[PDB]
Write a protein that binds this ligand. Sequence first.
Ligand SMILES: *[C@@H]1O[C@H](CO)[C@@H](O[C@@H]2O[C@H](CO)[C@@H](O)[C@H](O)[C@H]2NC(C)=O)[C@H](O)[C@H]1NC(C)=O
Ligand SMILES: *[C@@H]1O[C@H](CO)[C@@H](O)[C@H](O)[C@H]1NC(C)=O
Ligand SMILES: *[C@@H]1O[C@H](CO)[C@@H](O)[C@H](O)[C@H]1NC(C)=O
Ligand SMILES: *[C@@H]1O[C@H](CO)[C@@H](O)[C@H](O)[C@H]1NC(C)=O
Ligand SMILES: *[C@@H]1O[C@H](CO)[C@@H](O)[C@H](O)[C@H]1NC(C)=O
Ligand SMILES: *[C@@H]1O[C@H](CO)[C@@H](O)[C@H](O)[C@H]1NC(C)=O
Ligand SMILES: *[C@@H]1O[C@H](CO)[C@@H](O)[C@H](O)[C@H]1NC(C)=O
Ligand SMILES: *[C@@H]1O[C@H](CO)[C@@H](O)[C@H](O)[C@H]1NC(C)=O
Lengths: 271, 271
Amino acid sequence: PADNYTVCEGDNATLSCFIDEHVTRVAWLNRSNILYAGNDRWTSDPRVRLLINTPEEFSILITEVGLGDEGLYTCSFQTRHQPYTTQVYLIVHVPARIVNISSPVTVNEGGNVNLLCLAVGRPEPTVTWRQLRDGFTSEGEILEISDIQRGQAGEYECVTHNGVNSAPDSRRVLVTVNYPPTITDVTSARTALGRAALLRCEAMAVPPADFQWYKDDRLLSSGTAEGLKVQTERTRSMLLFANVSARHYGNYTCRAANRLGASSASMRLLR
Amino acid sequence: PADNYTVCEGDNATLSCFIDEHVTRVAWLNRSNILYAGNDRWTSDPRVRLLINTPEEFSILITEVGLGDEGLYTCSFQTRHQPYTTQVYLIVHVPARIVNISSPVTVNEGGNVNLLCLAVGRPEPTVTWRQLRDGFTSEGEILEISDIQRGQAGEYECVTHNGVNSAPDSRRVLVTVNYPPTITDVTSARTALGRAALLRCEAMAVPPADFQWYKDDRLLSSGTAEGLKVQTERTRSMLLFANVSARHYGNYTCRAANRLGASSASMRLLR
Ligand SMILES: *[C@@H]1O[C@H](CO)[C@@H](O[C@@H]2O[C@H](CO)[C@@H](O)[C@H](O)[C@H]2NC(C)=O)[C@H](O)[C@H]1NC(C)=O
Ligand SMILES: *[C@@H]1O[C@H](CO)[C@@H](O)[C@H](O)[C@H]1NC(C)=O
Ligand SMILES: *[C@@H]1O[C@H](CO)[C@@H](O)[C@H](O)[C@H]1NC(C)=O
Ligand SMILES: *[C@@H]1O[C@H](CO)[C@@H](O)[C@H](O)[C@H]1NC(C)=O
Ligand SMILES: *[C@@H]1O[C@H](CO)[C@@H](O)[C@H](O)[C@H]1NC(C)=O
Ligand SMILES: *[C@@H]1O[C@H](CO)[C@@H](O)[C@H](O)[C@H]1NC(C)=O
Ligand SMILES: *[C@@H]1O[C@H](CO)[C@@H](O)[C@H](O)[C@H]1NC(C)=O
Ligand SMILES: *[C@@H]1O[C@H](CO)[C@@H](O)[C@H](O)[C@H]1NC(C)=O
C-alpha cells in the first residue's frame, strides 16, 4: 500500500487525498512532519500550498520540487471509529545532463588517448560515446584509444540519457592526431626555353609540414634574384619559374618536415 | 536520536515533549497516526489523555498499556522557521510469572521425581530450579531427580525472571521422601533390684514409625498393670520401668514400622 508519485525536478507536485463524508480530521505529513492540519498551516515552507479542502478530497501542492523533497508523504485522517492512513512516496527525476567532458585534445599518431564524459541524472544516466566520421558506439563513461591512426582522428561525441522524456544533451569533442609528412604527389617539368614552368610537392602533415626546396645542393630563397618564387600551402608547395633561365635546368629536391618527421623527393627540369 | 521508553504491561505510560516558547504548533503521533493535536482530540481511543499543554511541554498519557501499544511515538512540532521531531519508542515488558508448578509430591526412597515449572513472560523468562536446604540449581523448566534419597527431601524452589525491573515471583514446592525406619540406637539395662531402669529404640521414619514393644512373647500396653509405661516419640520409644518387678526380667524386642518397612532389635533386662 505504498504508491509511487514520480515527478521531474522543478515541476509542481500535487498530493490529493480522497475521503468520504464522515471524516473527523485530516492532514498531510512530510515523513513524520505535519504540513497542513485541516486549514492550519504547520509547515513554514512557502512552497507548500493547499489546493482543495472539500469534505470529499483534501489536496495540497508543492511548488518547485527539489531533491530534498523525496520522501514518504502520508495522509493520516480519522473517522468517528478508527484512524486511517494513505501513503504516497515522492520520487524526483533529475533529467540527464553532461557536467564534464574532455577538452579538445591533440596527440601524436600511435599515441594513447582517454576521453571521459561525466554525466549526472536520476535515474543513473547511460553515457555513450560516438565517433562522428565513423560510426562506432561504446556504452561507457570513459573511452580509450590505443595507438590511434590518422583516420581515427576527428570529432568524438558523448550522449547521455536516463530514459526520461527530456532531451539527451549530447556534446562533442574534436580529436586531432599529429602525423609526420609523407609526400603523396611530385611533379616534374621538362619545358622548352621561353615558357614558364612549375614544380610541386604534396605532403599533408599535422602540424602542417614546413616545406623546403633544394636546387641540386643549394636551396631556394624565393627572391627575385634568379627569377624563382616558391608558393607555400598547407598541403603543397609549388616552385614557380618566371620566363626561363639557362641555369634553372638541373636536379631539384623538395623537403617536407614537421615536428614528427621529414620527407624528400627529387625531380628534374629538362628541355 | 531514538529513545526507549519501556513500560510493564498494564501500567500508565506518559509521553512528555519539552519545547521552547516559540512554538507555533505541537502534536504527538502514534506511528503515522495523529493522537492529539494541540487541544484537539484526533484519536478515538479513550485511553489516550492529554496531561500538560504548557507552552513549555506537551505531554500525554496512555492508560493500561498493551502489547499493541508498542511502537514509535513522535512529537512533531513547528517553530516560525523550521520543523522538529523528537521520537520515543514504546516497549512493553511482560513481567515474568509462574503459571504452573508441581504439587507437593511424595515418593518412596530411590524413586524418580520430575518437577516442572511453567512460567510466562515477554521476553522469554529464564526458569531456574533450586533446593532450599541444600544449594543445587538446574537451569531448566523441568527438574528430574533419579534415585531420590532421604537427605534430598525438603523444599524445592522455582524462580523465573525476564530481567525486567519487576519482581521474580518465586514459588516453592515441598518434596517429602518416605523412607522405612532403620533402628540406629538400642540400649539395654542391667540394674539391681530396687532401682529404676529403661529401654529405648531409635528408628527415624517418614511417616513416623509406629513403635511396638514386646516383653518376651507378649507386647506391652503401657498400662499401670505390671508397672510399665512406654513413651513413644517421632524418632524414639522409651520403655520405662518404675521400681522393679520379678516378672520384668527377661528378653525384650522393639519393633518400628511404617508404610515402607519394619525393623526389630532384641535387648535384655538383667540384674
Ligand atoms: C521534511 O522537512 C525537512 C525539514 O528539515 C526537510 O529537510 C530539508 O529540506 C530542504 C528542502 O527540501 C533541504 O534543502 C534540506 O537539506 C533538508 N534537510 C535539512 C536538515 O534542512 C525534508 O526535505 C522534508 N521532506 C520532504 C519529503 O518534504
Ligand atoms: C516504486 O518504486 C520502487 C523503486 O523504484 C520500486 O521498487 C517499486 O516497485 C515501485 N512501486 C510501484 C507501485 O511502482
Ligand atoms: C506551478 O505552480 C505555479 C503557481 O501557480 C505556476 O506559476 C507554474 O506555472 C506551475 N508550473 C507547473 C509546471 O505546473
Ligand atoms: C620575361 O620576358 C619578357 C619579354 O621578353 C621581359 O619583358 C621580362 O623582363 C622577362 N622577365 C623575366 C623575369 O625574365
Ligand atoms: C642531375 O640530373 C642528371 C640527369 O638526371 C644526372 O645525370 C646528374 O647526376 C644529376 N646531378 C648533377 C649534380 O648533375
Ligand atoms: C534506544 O535503544 C537503542 C537500542 O539499544 C540504543 O541504540 C539507543 O542509543 C537508545 N536511545 C537512547 C536515547 O537511549
Ligand atoms: C493511571 O491510569 C488510571 C486510569 O484510570 C488513573 O485512574 C490513575 O490515576 C493513573 N495513575 C496511577 C498511578 O495509577
Ligand atoms: C497505535 O498504533 C497501533 C498500530 O496502528 C495500534 O494498534 C494502536 O491501537 C495505536 N494506539 C496505541 C495507543 O497504541
